[PDB]
Amino acid sequence: DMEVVHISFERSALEQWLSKGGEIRGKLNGIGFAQKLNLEVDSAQHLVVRDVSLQGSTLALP
Amino acid sequence: MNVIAILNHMGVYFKEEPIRELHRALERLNFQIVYPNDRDDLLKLIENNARLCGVIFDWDKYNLELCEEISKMNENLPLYAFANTYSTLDVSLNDLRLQISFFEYALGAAEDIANKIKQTTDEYINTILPPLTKALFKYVREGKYTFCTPGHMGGTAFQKSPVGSLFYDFFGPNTMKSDISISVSELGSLLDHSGPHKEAEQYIARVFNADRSYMVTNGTSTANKIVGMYSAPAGSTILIDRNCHKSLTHLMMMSDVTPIYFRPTRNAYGILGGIPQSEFQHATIAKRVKETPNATWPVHAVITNSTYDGLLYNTDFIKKTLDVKSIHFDSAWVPYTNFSPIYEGKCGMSGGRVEGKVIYETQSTHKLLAAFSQASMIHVKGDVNEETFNEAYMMHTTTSPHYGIVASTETAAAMMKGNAGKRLINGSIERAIKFRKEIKRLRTESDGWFFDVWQPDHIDTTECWPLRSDSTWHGFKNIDNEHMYLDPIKVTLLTPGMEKDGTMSDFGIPASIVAKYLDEHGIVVEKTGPYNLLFLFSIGIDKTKALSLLRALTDFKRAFDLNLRVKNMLPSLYREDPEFYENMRIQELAQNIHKLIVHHNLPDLMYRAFEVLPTMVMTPYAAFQKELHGMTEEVYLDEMVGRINANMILPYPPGVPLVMPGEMITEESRPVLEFLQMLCEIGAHYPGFETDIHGAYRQADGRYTVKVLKE
Amino acid sequence: MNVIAILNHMGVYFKEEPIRELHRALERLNFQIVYPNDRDDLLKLIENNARLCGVIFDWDKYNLELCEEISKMNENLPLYAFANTYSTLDVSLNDLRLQISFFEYALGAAEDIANKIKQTTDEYINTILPPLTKALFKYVREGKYTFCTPGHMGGTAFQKSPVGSLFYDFFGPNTMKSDISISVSELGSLLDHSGPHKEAEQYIARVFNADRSYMVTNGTSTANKIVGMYSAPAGSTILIDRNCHKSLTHLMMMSDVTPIYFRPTRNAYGILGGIPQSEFQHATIAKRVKETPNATWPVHAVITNSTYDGLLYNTDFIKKTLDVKSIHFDSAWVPYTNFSPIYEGKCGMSGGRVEGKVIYETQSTHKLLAAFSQASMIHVKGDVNEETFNEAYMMHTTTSPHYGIVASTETAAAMMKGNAGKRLINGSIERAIKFRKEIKRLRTESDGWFFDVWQPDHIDTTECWPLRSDSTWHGFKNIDNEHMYLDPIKVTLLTPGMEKDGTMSDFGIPASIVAKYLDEHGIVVEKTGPYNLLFLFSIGIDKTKALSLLRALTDFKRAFDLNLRVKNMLPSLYREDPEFYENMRIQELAQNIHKLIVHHNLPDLMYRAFEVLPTMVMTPYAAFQKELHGMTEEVYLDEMVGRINANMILPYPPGVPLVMPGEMITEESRPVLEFLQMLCEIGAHYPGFETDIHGAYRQADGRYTVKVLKE
Ligand SMILES: *Cc1c(COP(=O)(O)O)cnc(C)c1O
Ligand SMILES: *Cc1c(COP(=O)(O)O)cnc(C)c1O
């Protein structure tokens, strides 16, 4: 129930989810706690972020 | 697969005339026609006859007595039921898997009906078979590629040599054309694990309830080496079980690791018990780490579930107390603990995914199932490394596997799905419990001694008998409750010779004499020795082999009570030494061997030589390095106290290792050496009963010599 | 046609010996001999076996139990009854159409009897067949006229080409020999309306109750354009229905006329009702003439009776209220409203000639009957010009018609004549009503959801259920009583998902998923989309094809209640996208689609869109003139308000047109544009259920484009 322009992930927590699986936890706008998100894998090797409306969003690095 | 059943007779003519016209049409496409009688007649043509795929009956006669019993035996079985004008379904026919094909009673259209049955039968073949086996059968009739491996190319080179034609005509044309390498595009490669091979591994994991089952093309002895090299780097610590196999010994000799051996339980008859629950604790494992030099935290544990005899464990307690991230379950003898309600929560696959851990199972395929040799599976339940275990599989598997074994390995998994596969496990249990009741029935009513089954006093139930602490049949001193279970199909016959307290008796017959009598009729004994027996009652053991075993046991009592001769009973033993076994009878040999067991005291020396583990000096990997350099010597058996052996001692009986390659026999393991010298004296007076110990070489004087390491 | 029945075994020898002698004589001329049992056995050899033409029975045994039941089925069926010395007729055997051939019991005269049966059988063939078909079969066995069209001449050129032999050997030698044109003298010509073709047109109109009827050899789509161009000059006014066909739209684009669209009724499930009785008034039609520029008095009216779903209207009220001299009825789905008493006064042919008017009907032949494709009829009921209507028929029919379809077109009129054809029309209704009762029986007794038939609560009758105003099963508000009928052979399955008031629910499965589940067994839904399942229960659906549909419906409930996977249920859908449809079950897909319908609000954006009509700027004939000159362009779907389209929008679902070629979307038809944009969003998330609109081209980004005209 809020807008976001950048999402930060932890390197020690990203390698575990991309190898063993499960769920990922990441904060929003660099503040707050590491909330759970609906992140999945893409067919074109990307990161699609799903929300409550089943919308796609490809992540990118600066 | 060409049996068509036509049940019942309506007595009219407009319904029997289409049957007579169809009788002459189905025979043109190679189909057997059978005419069953009543309802109980058709039920016997399915359980006993598996090559049936067509059931023709009137829909307006038995719409509920046939659609319920057939559904309990096969789900995809075609039902060529003929309906009428006023025909409808039933409310009790919604939750049943059936394949009903409706037709009419039209004259002249019998030819069109025969084409529909043949096409429907072809759909049944292309459905129950996996995509890997189906593609192999279709490749023979269509795929005709040239310039490929192997060089025979479907048996072409064998048709140009006189000696090659005899080898080609033995198997068949479809046999040689099915042996193809990875030179086929529409079948994929096994090393690549793509195409048909990708869906084949996911199909077996769904049937046997696993994540991604594998198909080993070298056997069970090889699968234990690939998995062992995963959770055991060059310098770690593993928790291998004491009751290990010959293949597990070479695993410790090829990896620079420090294994820790357990202390399983045992009785006096020789039946291998299990590991107590105290060894799975955290304070017990951590205590042996400091006492063992060069050993860190254990990262792998090997558990033999079940053992060679047939005693399951309790995985509901090991997967919570044993804090090992890599627990192994050598399921090389129980490839069925899934398709039965009396086997829930007893193996590694039953249950959920344990977090932070992983379960390995090397289930043997060509042991208690139906497939070619050199076949095994790997059941992984957890999280492993992707770029680690992949390299370990290619080091023991060739680049050109034999698809004839792969097609039979996945076939055993396809034979278990549905009601047709569930009746194979439950059918062997019902035949085993019935055989257990026939022993107790022929024991009290008989007049004299009779065989006994190692089973509780109450076998009325149909489940795994737990080994409680208030019983006297198991004979295990201080056993954990709700931890050791009994295998119903593993019937353990106990010959009269010992008491219930662990001592001996005056009248007794060893199990080695009975094992030689069963081989005369063709019955091969799996395990034998002191006063115990073991047989394999898998899904391939029908009611003929079960009833034939009891008849061979009753004939041994008749030949022993009447006091017959050895020549007129054991012709194979007489040919070994006709001079010594001349005037000897069956009662003289059975009593002379029984006195040697009491004199040499076998149950006391065997029970004390297995509990005290010898002192392990170095790791088993370092013992093999000294052998390649040429630092091995052969010494006598009576001159070896304080030396390091080179091979593994496997005395028969029993069937468990004694001294691991790399251990030393000091003053603590004194009864261990006494067990080897006792078998050399009892197995040297009567021919045929020689001492069988893997590792002891026989000389020209009688004293066995072992291979040790130089100082 | 070579089945001979011999009923009743007297037991004596002087009557059974001539039967044995006749058994060996009839087989020499290719005849099958059957022996029924009792009286009920012979009755089953006629309704199910239609290739029978000989019944042999004792006249002095069953003279009243067989001459009454057989007469109710076939009238011209020969009866080879054997009489005796004291034999006579009955007073109750005078008003029955039978063909009894008496004989005797004489030895040696069995050869003369066989010649009389073959001659009598030939008389039955030369009677039930029309003279047009009789001339076609006789020309194959005896006609040898050379130098005729086509060039193959029975398949002569096919015997000289390697590829031509495969196409000739598939059908048969007698198939190509019947392919002749107007190059035959003893068969006449179809365009000349003389000879056998003259008597064929009078035979079809007499059976179907008509004055003059033709034989269209290009389907119903062509017959509608011939009649429409007969009473619609350039610049007149026609009354075409809104629920028209693809061919009916092109008729407005080929003639410069001013059409006036009606306002049919509709509900929320997508089933279109009919035209209300208020639209047929004189003040309603005359009001739309002044509002529409360039429009005179309507001289032709096109009424779709029945529609695509199968809903009969009330012709007893249209032929008195509608003041149109040329009323047309699109009877492309009811080629049988005459052979049953529950269809009187429901079509145009039923009744009499209307004074000052004429009725046109295009009864389809290959749709719901038994004939080759591309076959239609033109039923004319009135006083029309023969020299004028004949020239309009040649404008779309070639000079060399295909007699293979013409022979089957008249065959449908002969297969329904008599009591033998009435058992097929009424038989399909009885099989349809029986299937309707099997759904309600398996709905309350079941434990959970079940399919529902769009039918009233009381179906305990055999007639057309009227759509009253005090019912909730149809859901048509402001409906007129005694105007809307129901076709019993048009079972519309209503899948759960909506309520009875027209809103949405919480648990339901769309009809699009069920449509693909039936395709695996060989069942294609005629109309699917929202929550309806239309099926065709014509004469081609026997008791086998009807009961096979109920079994597939019960399997969908079992597979959905147990929560199965998509790969293990829908193999055709899994091959479209194995990556996306991997970890998906049947319950996850059924719930995600149901939420998209409620979110996008489908029943509201479809009911309001079909109610309003876009502003028709010019006539549909003028829109096609601008397309030939090249004044067309492709624009986006979101940028088209205020433009004139070039093609007809046909979105799936449902199956009715949306915007006619030549209309403009202004501010009145706002929900019309919202219906197109809603389907583009719901049909893009999950594969397989893409948007199907005949007129919207798919690009490379997702947005569809339409074809409009240049400004
Ligand atoms: C019999 C056995 C093996 C050997 O099986 P193969 O498939 O023939 O190699 C390996 N491990 C155990 C525990 C066995 O009992
Ligand atoms: C199916 C249909 C047609 C087309 O029928 P054909 O004989 O194939 O030309 C024409 N009009 C209506 C109303 C139809 O349902």
PDB file of C-alpha atoms in Angstrom, chain C residues 431-596:
ATOM      1  CA  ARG C 431     -32.864 -39.710 -26.276  1.00  0.00           C
ATOM      2  CA  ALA C 432     -32.486 -35.980 -25.583  1.00  0.00           C
ATOM      3  CA  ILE C 433     -35.180 -35.861 -22.889  1.00  0.00           C
ATOM      4  CA  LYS C 434     -33.674 -38.968 -21.281  1.00  0.00           C
ATOM      5  CA  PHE C 435     -30.293 -37.220 -21.163  1.00  0.00           C
ATOM      6  CA  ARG C 436     -31.955 -34.191 -19.554  1.00  0.00           C
ATOM      7  CA  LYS C 437     -33.343 -36.346 -16.735  1.00  0.00           C
ATOM      8  CA  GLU C 438     -29.975 -38.034 -16.148  1.00  0.00           C
ATOM      9  CA  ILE C 439     -28.433 -34.650 -15.310  1.00  0.00           C
ATOM     10  CA  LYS C 440     -30.991 -33.721 -12.646  1.00  0.00           C
ATOM     11  CA  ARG C 441     -30.753 -37.240 -11.203  1.00  0.00           C
ATOM     12  CA  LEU C 442     -26.959 -37.006 -10.826  1.00  0.00           C
ATOM     13  CA  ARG C 443     -27.153 -33.465  -9.379  1.00  0.00           C
ATOM     14  CA  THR C 444     -29.062 -33.838  -6.103  1.00  0.00           C
ATOM     15  CA  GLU C 445     -27.725 -37.325  -5.345  1.00  0.00           C
ATOM     16  CA  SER C 446     -24.149 -36.148  -5.943  1.00  0.00           C
ATOM     17  CA  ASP C 447     -21.948 -34.718  -3.180  1.00  0.00           C
ATOM     18  CA  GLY C 448     -20.826 -31.349  -4.508  1.00  0.00           C
ATOM     19  CA  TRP C 449     -21.304 -29.238  -7.606  1.00  0.00           C
ATOM     20  CA  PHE C 450     -22.685 -30.674 -10.836  1.00  0.00           C
ATOM     21  CA  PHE C 451     -23.668 -29.486 -14.297  1.00  0.00           C
ATOM     22  CA  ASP C 452     -27.115 -28.005 -14.918  1.00  0.00           C
ATOM     23  CA  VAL C 453     -29.285 -28.115 -18.044  1.00  0.00           C
ATOM     24  CA  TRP C 454     -30.898 -24.854 -19.195  1.00  0.00           C
ATOM     25  CA  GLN C 455     -34.403 -26.262 -18.801  1.00  0.00           C
ATOM     26  CA  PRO C 456     -37.480 -25.603 -16.640  1.00  0.00           C
ATOM     27  CA  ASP C 457     -37.932 -27.332 -13.303  1.00  0.00           C
ATOM     28  CA  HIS C 458     -40.694 -29.550 -14.756  1.00  0.00           C
ATOM     29  CA  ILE C 459     -39.572 -31.597 -17.767  1.00  0.00           C
ATOM     30  CA  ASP C 460     -42.078 -34.435 -17.353  1.00  0.00           C
ATOM     31  CA  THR C 461     -43.398 -34.015 -20.903  1.00  0.00           C
ATOM     32  CA  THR C 462     -42.442 -34.587 -24.544  1.00  0.00           C
ATOM     33  CA  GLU C 463     -42.981 -31.214 -26.233  1.00  0.00           C
ATOM     34  CA  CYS C 464     -41.465 -27.745 -26.583  1.00  0.00           C
ATOM     35  CA  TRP C 465     -41.221 -26.070 -23.180  1.00  0.00           C
ATOM     36  CA  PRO C 466     -42.589 -22.509 -23.478  1.00  0.00           C
ATOM     37  CA  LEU C 467     -40.721 -19.585 -21.930  1.00  0.00           C
ATOM     38  CA  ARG C 468     -43.280 -18.104 -19.552  1.00  0.00           C
ATOM     39  CA  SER C 469     -43.007 -14.880 -17.558  1.00  0.00           C
ATOM     40  CA  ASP C 470     -43.132 -16.529 -14.101  1.00  0.00           C
ATOM     41  CA  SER C 471     -39.911 -18.560 -14.389  1.00  0.00           C
ATOM     42  CA  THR C 472     -36.286 -17.999 -13.403  1.00  0.00           C
ATOM     43  CA  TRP C 473     -34.509 -20.677 -15.464  1.00  0.00           C
ATOM     44  CA  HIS C 474     -34.390 -18.602 -18.666  1.00  0.00           C
ATOM     45  CA  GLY C 475     -33.655 -15.213 -17.090  1.00  0.00           C
ATOM     46  CA  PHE C 476     -35.222 -13.032 -19.806  1.00  0.00           C
ATOM     47  CA  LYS C 477     -36.936  -9.994 -18.308  1.00  0.00           C
ATOM     48  CA  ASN C 478     -39.915  -8.423 -20.103  1.00  0.00           C
ATOM     49  CA  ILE C 479     -40.397 -11.616 -22.127  1.00  0.00           C
ATOM     50  CA  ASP C 480     -43.545 -12.201 -24.175  1.00  0.00           C
ATOM     51  CA  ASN C 481     -45.652 -15.261 -23.398  1.00  0.00           C
ATOM     52  CA  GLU C 482     -46.398 -17.843 -26.107  1.00  0.00           C
ATOM     53  CA  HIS C 483     -43.604 -16.576 -28.355  1.00  0.00           C
ATOM     54  CA  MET C 484     -40.378 -18.216 -27.142  1.00  0.00           C
ATOM     55  CA  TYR C 485     -40.029 -21.991 -27.512  1.00  0.00           C
ATOM     56  CA  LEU C 486     -37.367 -24.496 -26.471  1.00  0.00           C
ATOM     57  CA  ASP C 487     -35.755 -27.198 -28.602  1.00  0.00           C
ATOM     58  CA  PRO C 488     -35.546 -30.471 -26.620  1.00  0.00           C
ATOM     59  CA  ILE C 489     -32.604 -31.742 -28.701  1.00  0.00           C
ATOM     60  CA  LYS C 490     -30.663 -28.565 -27.866  1.00  0.00           C
ATOM     61  CA  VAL C 491     -29.303 -29.312 -24.398  1.00  0.00           C
ATOM     62  CA  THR C 492     -27.368 -26.310 -23.056  1.00  0.00           C
ATOM     63  CA  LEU C 493     -25.227 -27.246 -20.056  1.00  0.00           C
ATOM     64  CA  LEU C 494     -24.898 -24.361 -17.586  1.00  0.00           C
ATOM     65  CA  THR C 495     -21.632 -24.612 -15.667  1.00  0.00           C
ATOM     66  CA  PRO C 496     -21.678 -23.324 -12.071  1.00  0.00           C
ATOM     67  CA  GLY C 497     -20.272 -19.859 -11.486  1.00  0.00           C
ATOM     68  CA  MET C 498     -23.231 -17.476 -11.651  1.00  0.00           C
ATOM     69  CA  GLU C 499     -26.429 -16.979  -9.674  1.00  0.00           C
ATOM     70  CA  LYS C 500     -30.053 -16.949 -10.862  1.00  0.00           C
ATOM     71  CA  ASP C 501     -30.341 -13.135 -10.776  1.00  0.00           C
ATOM     72  CA  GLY C 502     -27.543 -12.447 -13.278  1.00  0.00           C
ATOM     73  CA  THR C 503     -24.692 -11.576 -10.899  1.00  0.00           C
ATOM     74  CA  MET C 504     -21.501 -13.524 -10.097  1.00  0.00           C
ATOM     75  CA  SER C 505     -20.588 -16.055  -7.422  1.00  0.00           C
ATOM     76  CA  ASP C 506     -17.499 -17.198  -5.494  1.00  0.00           C
ATOM     77  CA  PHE C 507     -16.966 -20.803  -6.651  1.00  0.00           C
ATOM     78  CA  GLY C 508     -17.247 -21.814 -10.289  1.00  0.00           C
ATOM     79  CA  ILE C 509     -15.455 -23.191 -13.326  1.00  0.00           C
ATOM     80  CA  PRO C 510     -15.656 -21.439 -16.724  1.00  0.00           C
ATOM     81  CA  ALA C 511     -16.905 -23.318 -19.768  1.00  0.00           C
ATOM     82  CA  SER C 512     -13.654 -22.725 -21.678  1.00  0.00           C
ATOM     83  CA  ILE C 513     -11.748 -25.218 -19.513  1.00  0.00           C
ATOM     84  CA  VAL C 514     -14.410 -27.915 -19.921  1.00  0.00           C
ATOM     85  CA  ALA C 515     -14.377 -27.437 -23.705  1.00  0.00           C
ATOM     86  CA  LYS C 516     -10.731 -28.525 -23.911  1.00  0.00           C
ATOM     87  CA  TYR C 517     -11.212 -31.410 -21.461  1.00  0.00           C
ATOM     88  CA  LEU C 518     -13.828 -32.997 -23.732  1.00  0.00           C
ATOM     89  CA  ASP C 519     -11.505 -32.715 -26.749  1.00  0.00           C
ATOM     90  CA  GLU C 520      -9.181 -35.396 -25.342  1.00  0.00           C
ATOM     91  CA  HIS C 521     -11.917 -38.025 -25.788  1.00  0.00           C
ATOM     92  CA  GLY C 522     -13.188 -36.709 -29.132  1.00  0.00           C
ATOM     93  CA  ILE C 523     -15.918 -34.269 -28.080  1.00  0.00           C
ATOM     94  CA  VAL C 524     -15.932 -30.693 -29.407  1.00  0.00           C
ATOM     95  CA  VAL C 525     -18.312 -28.188 -27.826  1.00  0.00           C
ATOM     96  CA  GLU C 526     -20.498 -26.446 -30.398  1.00  0.00           C
ATOM     97  CA  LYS C 527     -20.669 -23.176 -28.428  1.00  0.00           C
ATOM     98  CA  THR C 528     -18.552 -22.327 -25.383  1.00  0.00           C
ATOM     99  CA  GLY C 529     -17.164 -19.259 -23.660  1.00  0.00           C
ATOM    100  CA  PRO C 530     -18.940 -17.744 -20.654  1.00  0.00           C
ATOM    101  CA  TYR C 531     -20.834 -20.456 -18.758  1.00  0.00           C
ATOM    102  CA  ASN C 532     -22.677 -22.463 -21.421  1.00  0.00           C
ATOM    103  CA  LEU C 533     -22.110 -25.731 -23.297  1.00  0.00           C
ATOM    104  CA  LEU C 534     -24.171 -26.231 -26.457  1.00  0.00           C
ATOM    105  CA  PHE C 535     -24.490 -29.673 -28.039  1.00  0.00           C
ATOM    106  CA  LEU C 536     -26.276 -31.098 -31.079  1.00  0.00           C
ATOM    107  CA  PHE C 537     -28.552 -34.107 -30.530  1.00  0.00           C
ATOM    108  CA  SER C 538     -29.683 -34.695 -34.109  1.00  0.00           C
ATOM    109  CA  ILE C 539     -30.352 -37.995 -35.884  1.00  0.00           C
ATOM    110  CA  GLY C 540     -26.613 -38.728 -36.047  1.00  0.00           C
ATOM    111  CA  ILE C 541     -26.350 -39.061 -32.258  1.00  0.00           C
ATOM    112  CA  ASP C 542     -27.379 -42.621 -31.390  1.00  0.00           C
ATOM    113  CA  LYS C 543     -27.516 -44.251 -27.942  1.00  0.00           C
ATOM    114  CA  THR C 544     -23.733 -44.754 -27.992  1.00  0.00           C
ATOM    115  CA  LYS C 545     -22.786 -41.138 -28.728  1.00  0.00           C
ATOM    116  CA  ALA C 546     -25.298 -39.881 -26.145  1.00  0.00           C
ATOM    117  CA  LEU C 547     -24.173 -42.054 -23.221  1.00  0.00           C
ATOM    118  CA  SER C 548     -20.502 -41.349 -23.979  1.00  0.00           C
ATOM    119  CA  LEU C 549     -21.071 -37.658 -23.211  1.00  0.00           C
ATOM    120  CA  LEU C 550     -22.382 -38.303 -19.690  1.00  0.00           C
ATOM    121  CA  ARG C 551     -19.368 -40.444 -18.769  1.00  0.00           C
ATOM    122  CA  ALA C 552     -16.930 -37.678 -19.734  1.00  0.00           C
ATOM    123  CA  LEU C 553     -18.830 -35.178 -17.572  1.00  0.00           C
ATOM    124  CA  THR C 554     -18.551 -37.393 -14.485  1.00  0.00           C
ATOM    125  CA  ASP C 555     -14.794 -37.725 -15.037  1.00  0.00           C
ATOM    126  CA  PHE C 556     -14.345 -33.942 -14.847  1.00  0.00           C
ATOM    127  CA  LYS C 557     -15.832 -33.811 -11.340  1.00  0.00           C
ATOM    128  CA  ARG C 558     -13.598 -36.651 -10.131  1.00  0.00           C
ATOM    129  CA  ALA C 559     -10.439 -35.059 -11.546  1.00  0.00           C
ATOM    130  CA  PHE C 560     -11.341 -31.666 -10.044  1.00  0.00           C
ATOM    131  CA  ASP C 561     -12.352 -32.832  -6.557  1.00  0.00           C
ATOM    132  CA  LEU C 562      -9.109 -34.803  -6.139  1.00  0.00           C
ATOM    133  CA  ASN C 563      -7.054 -31.755  -7.237  1.00  0.00           C
ATOM    134  CA  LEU C 564      -4.955 -33.204 -10.069  1.00  0.00           C
ATOM    135  CA  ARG C 565      -2.212 -31.610 -12.138  1.00  0.00           C
ATOM    136  CA  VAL C 566      -2.588 -30.052 -15.577  1.00  0.00           C
ATOM    137  CA  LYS C 567       0.023 -32.330 -17.162  1.00  0.00           C
ATOM    138  CA  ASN C 568      -1.786 -35.420 -15.816  1.00  0.00           C
ATOM    139  CA  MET C 569      -5.179 -34.259 -17.137  1.00  0.00           C
ATOM    140  CA  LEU C 570      -4.784 -31.899 -20.124  1.00  0.00           C
ATOM    141  CA  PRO C 571      -1.876 -33.107 -22.292  1.00  0.00           C
ATOM    142  CA  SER C 572      -2.865 -30.861 -25.212  1.00  0.00           C
ATOM    143  CA  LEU C 573      -2.720 -27.694 -23.100  1.00  0.00           C
ATOM    144  CA  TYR C 574       0.598 -28.720 -21.524  1.00  0.00           C
ATOM    145  CA  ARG C 575       2.308 -28.928 -24.926  1.00  0.00           C
ATOM    146  CA  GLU C 576       1.464 -25.283 -25.669  1.00  0.00           C
ATOM    147  CA  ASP C 577       3.633 -23.928 -22.824  1.00  0.00           C
ATOM    148  CA  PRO C 578       5.359 -26.581 -20.689  1.00  0.00           C
ATOM    149  CA  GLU C 579       7.311 -23.931 -18.756  1.00  0.00           C
ATOM    150  CA  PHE C 580       4.351 -21.884 -17.503  1.00  0.00           C
ATOM    151  CA  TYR C 581       1.996 -24.859 -16.989  1.00  0.00           C
ATOM    152  CA  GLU C 582       4.532 -26.841 -14.916  1.00  0.00           C
ATOM    153  CA  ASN C 583       3.638 -26.409 -11.224  1.00  0.00           C
ATOM    154  CA  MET C 584      -0.066 -25.742 -11.885  1.00  0.00           C
ATOM    155  CA  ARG C 585      -3.054 -27.851 -10.829  1.00  0.00           C
ATOM    156  CA  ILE C 586      -6.650 -28.000 -12.026  1.00  0.00           C
ATOM    157  CA  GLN C 587      -7.891 -26.046  -8.992  1.00  0.00           C
ATOM    158  CA  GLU C 588      -5.349 -23.223  -9.310  1.00  0.00           C
ATOM    159  CA  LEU C 589      -6.248 -22.571 -12.954  1.00  0.00           C
ATOM    160  CA  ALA C 590     -10.002 -22.774 -12.340  1.00  0.00           C
ATOM    161  CA  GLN C 591      -9.885 -20.196  -9.533  1.00  0.00           C
ATOM    162  CA  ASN C 592      -7.539 -17.671 -11.165  1.00  0.00           C
ATOM    163  CA  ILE C 593      -9.714 -17.374 -14.278  1.00  0.00           C
ATOM    164  CA  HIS C 594     -12.909 -16.974 -12.234  1.00  0.00           C
ATOM    165  CA  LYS C 595     -11.409 -13.993 -10.392  1.00  0.00           C
ATOM    166  CA  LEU C 596     -10.515 -12.292 -13.684  1.00  0.00           C
TER     167      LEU C 596
END
